[PDB]
Amino acid sequence: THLADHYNQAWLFAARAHRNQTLSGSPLPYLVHLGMVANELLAADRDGAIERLGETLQIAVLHDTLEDTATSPEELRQQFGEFVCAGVQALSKRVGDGPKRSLDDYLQALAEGPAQYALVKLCDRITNLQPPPQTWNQDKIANYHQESQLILARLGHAHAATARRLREKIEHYRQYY
Amino acid sequence: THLADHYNQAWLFAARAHRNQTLSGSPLPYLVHLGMVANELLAADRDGAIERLGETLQIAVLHDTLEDTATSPEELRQQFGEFVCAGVQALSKRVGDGPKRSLDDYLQALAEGPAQYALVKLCDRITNLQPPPQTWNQDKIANYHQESQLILARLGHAHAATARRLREKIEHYRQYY
Ligand code: NI
Numbered sequence: 001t002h003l004a005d006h007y008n009q010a011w012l013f014a015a016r017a018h019r020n021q022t023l024s025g026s027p028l029p030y031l032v033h034l035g036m037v038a039n040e041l042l043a044a045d046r047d048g049a050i051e052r053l054g055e056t057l058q059i060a061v062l063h064d065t066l067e068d069t070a071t072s073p074e075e076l077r078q079q080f081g082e083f084v085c086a087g088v089q090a091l092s093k094r095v096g097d098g099p100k101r102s103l104d105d106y107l108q109a110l111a112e113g114p115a116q117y118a119l120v121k122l123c124d125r126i127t128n129l130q131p132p133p134q135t136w137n138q139d140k141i142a143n144y145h146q147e148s149q150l151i152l153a154r155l156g157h158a159h160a161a162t163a164r165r166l167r168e169k170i171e172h173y174r175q176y177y
Numbered sequence: 178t179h180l181a182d183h184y185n186q187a188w189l190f191a192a193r194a195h196r197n198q199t200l201s202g203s204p205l206p207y208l209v210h211l212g213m214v215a216n217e218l219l220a221a222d223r224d225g226a227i228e229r230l231g232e233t234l235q236i237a238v239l240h241d242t243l244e245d246t247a248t249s250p251e252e253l254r255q256q257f258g259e260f261v262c263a264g265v266q267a268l269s270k271r272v273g274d275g276p277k278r279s280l281d282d283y284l285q286a287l288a289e290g291p292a293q294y295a296l297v298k299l300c301d302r303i304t305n306l307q308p309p310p311q312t313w314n315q316d317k318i319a320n321y322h323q324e325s326q327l328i329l330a331r332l333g334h335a336h337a338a339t340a341r342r343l344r345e346k347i348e349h350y351r352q353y354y
Pocket residue numbers: 033063064124
C-alpha cells in the first residue's frame with residue numbers, strides 16, 4: 001500500500017472525527033494542527049529513515065482521536081491495525097476527561113515503547129512551538145517552554161534529526177516571554 | 178530553512194485564505210483536499226528527488242488560492258517568491274476575474290513550463306480520483322475519467338513514479354461508472 005494511501009485513509013478518518021473542532025481560540029479547523037504534525041513526520045524520514053513509516057504517518061494524523069473525539073480503540077484497531085491503535089493510545093494522556101496520566105508516567109511509557117510513537121510526540125511538540133496564542137500569560141508560556149524541555153530530554157533519543165529541530169524550536173520559543 | 182517550515186508558512190496562509198470553503202457537497206473543510214495534495218507531493222520526492230522541493234510543496238498547498246480566494250499574485254510573490262507565485266498562476270485556469278483558459282492551453286503551458294508545476298497537477302488529479310462525490314451521475318464520472326486520461330498524457334513526463342501512480346488511479350476509477 002502506497003504511503004499516500006496510508007495518509008489518505010487516516011486523514012479522512014481524522015477530518016470526520018474532528019469535524020466539529022477548531023484550534024483552541026481560532027476559527028481554523030483542528031485539522032490545521034494534524035497537517036503540520038504529519039508533514040513534520042514525513043519530513044523527519046528524509047533526515048533518518050523510519051521503520052513502519054506508513055503506519056507512523058497514520059499515528060501522526062490520528063494522535064488526538066482518542067483524547068478529543070467519539071473514536072474508540074476498537075475502531076482504530078479494526079481500520080488501522082494494532083500498531084496504529086497502540087501508538088494513538090501511547091500518545092493519549094486521557095481518553096476523554098477520565099483517568100489522566102501524569103507527564104512523568106506518560107513520557108516514561110513513550111520512552112520505553114516503540115521509538116516511532118516517541119517520534120510522533122517530538123513532531124507534535126515541534127508543531128506546538130509556533131508563537132503562542134495572544135491569550136497566554138507569561139507564566140503559561142514559561143510553563144509550556146519548561147514542559148517542552150522535559151519532552152526533548154525524555155524522548156529526543158527517538159530520532160536525532162528531529163531532536164536537533166526540537167532543540168532549535170525550544171531555543172527560539174524563549175523570545176516569546 | 179527547513180522543509181517543514183516551508184510547509185507551515187504556506188499551510189497557515191492556505192487555511193486562512195480558504196477558511197469559508199468546503200469540499201464538493203461535503204461539510205468538511207477544503208483544507209482536507211490541500212493536505213492530501215501536499216502529502217502526495219512530499220511522498221513523490223521519495224520515489225524520485227524534485228528540485229526546489231520546499232517551494233514545490235508550498236505550490237501544492239497554495240495551488241487553489243488564486244482561483245478560489247481573495248489572494249492576489251502580489252501577496253504570493255511578496256510572501257513566497259516568484260517561483261511559487263508563477264506556479265500557482267500556472268495551475269490557475271482563471272485568477273478570480275479574467276477569462277478561463279481552456280484545458281488544451283492550460284495543459285500545454287504546464288507541459289512546456291517548469292516540471293514541478295506539472296508534478297503538482299499530477300498530485301492534484303491523483304487526489305481527485307478518490308471515489309467521486311455522491312451527487313455525480315455516470316456521464317459526469319465518465320467525463321472526469323476522460324479528462325484525467327488527458328492530464329496523464331500531457332503531464333506524465335514530469336515525474337515517472339507519480340505518472341505510474343496516476344495511471345493506477347485512472348485504472349481503479351473505471352470501477353465507479
Ligand atoms: Ni497534537
